Write a protein that binds this ligand. Sequence first.
Ligand SMILES: COC(=O)c1cccc(-c2cc3c(=O)[nH]ccc3o2)c1
Ligand SMILES: COC(=O)c1cccc(-c2cc3c(=O)[nH]ccc3o2)c1
Lengths: 116, 120, 121, 120
Amino acid sequence: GITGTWYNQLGSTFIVTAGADGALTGTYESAESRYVLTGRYDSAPATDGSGTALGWTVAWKNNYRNAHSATTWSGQYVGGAEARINTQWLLTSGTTEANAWKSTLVGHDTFTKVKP
Amino acid sequence: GITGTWYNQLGSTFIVTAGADGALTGTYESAVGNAESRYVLTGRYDSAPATDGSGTALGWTVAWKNNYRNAHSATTWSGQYVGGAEARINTQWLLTSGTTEANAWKSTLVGHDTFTKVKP
Amino acid sequence: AGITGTWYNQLGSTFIVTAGADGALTGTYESAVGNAESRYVLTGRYDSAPATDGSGTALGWTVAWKNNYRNAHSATTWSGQYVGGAEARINTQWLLTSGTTEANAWKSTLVGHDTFTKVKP
Amino acid sequence: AGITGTWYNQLGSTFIVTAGADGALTGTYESAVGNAESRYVLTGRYDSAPATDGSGTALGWTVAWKNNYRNAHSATTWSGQYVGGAEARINTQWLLTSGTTEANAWKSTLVGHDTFTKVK
Ligand SMILES: COC(=O)c1cccc(-c2cc3c(=O)[nH]ccc3o2)c1
Ligand SMILES: COC(=O)c1cccc(-c2cc3c(=O)[nH]ccc3o2)c1
């Protein structure tokens, strides 16, 4: 249920293949705009109504731009008629030590299979 | 650089390779939690960082399933590598467990780990 | 209109708050989840002179989960901003830390996000 | 309770708090220098009847970064636990939210951690 195209609340698109070995691979488009993503998921989740745990990372460098930063999303996939990937994220920028206190933003993204 | 064997402040072991393409690959052995032996990790890093003294941004994920245990959970670490005399990777992390919807509000733990190339 | 009033989050918790002229937040919180029963004291702070460029109003508050009925040995802080408009909203992220031993401190803190409206969802 | 008094973080910030009998935290948060322009009101809550099994004491507090001299249009909350003893600590994680437009709300909140001690 994870493999495919997902859309967040703010116009980003998250394209992923969930491999048999637990790998997540794909591309993330935040709007020149496409970036590699890589992560992991629980390939043997419970079958009791619980979600499937997962996470992935995008480093914001491609052949066109480099923000010197990376985001990790941590969350769970929930299947069914209104399937979702519900996540919280951390976005760390490369900084000097003096600016490291303000290096990390936090937020949350909800992904759906149908454009918002 | 990033490639090497690292240890967090609690004794976990982070064996990572930073590839030419921005890929992080390797294994993680946890000193806490419902964990036993090595787990696969994968992630990404900035392969062309700034040249102004700033650190190198990175992140990686471990899903806590291997051939011996499955905790139905996954941790992501987000941080930066800082070079120098004692190289360091400073991170914050999120650990999400699979839950029912009614329990989703308590699904995610947060903390911070610092990694060096020497054991604590 | 403003921060003062009765608010509800997406899970049905009830947040009754007064925003004082000095920047103070006071009131009570009743949680729809967790080891909680009835109302708990909250205190916090807000920006009493927000920017005039369309930005929201920054704020935060704390509940320690002890009252006359129960004590969960934990505390939540919500950090967020009030957004005025047709449907007023307070958007927050929160940290819930439990008292633990040192060996369990790594798993002491939960994180999440709550959105509050003056209309109960 | 051991909480009342002056505490110092790892980066040169100071706070002076009073822990009231029924769970109130009140005080001031400032910089190491301590000039009036760096001082802000703080308010929060703590568990006034913690466990007796060796666990820490849960607490939290908020500073809105407005005083009579400047206004950053932002607020920080610290969530953590107090641990007593000869090397007492308050170990926290924090969230700093700025007032933003909706278009910029995705980047409104910074996260980090502070460790407070009784000595600078
Ligand atoms: C439900 O399962 C878990 O909560 C669990 C299981 C196994 C290992 C971990 C673990 C290890 C580790 C670490 O070294 N640093 C930061 C977080 C973290 O989490 C967590
Ligand atoms: C194990 O959990 C607790 O110790 C506990 C006890 C009482 C209430 C809560 C509670 C309510 C609430 C909420 O509405 N939003 C965000 C966090 C949050 O936490 C947690």
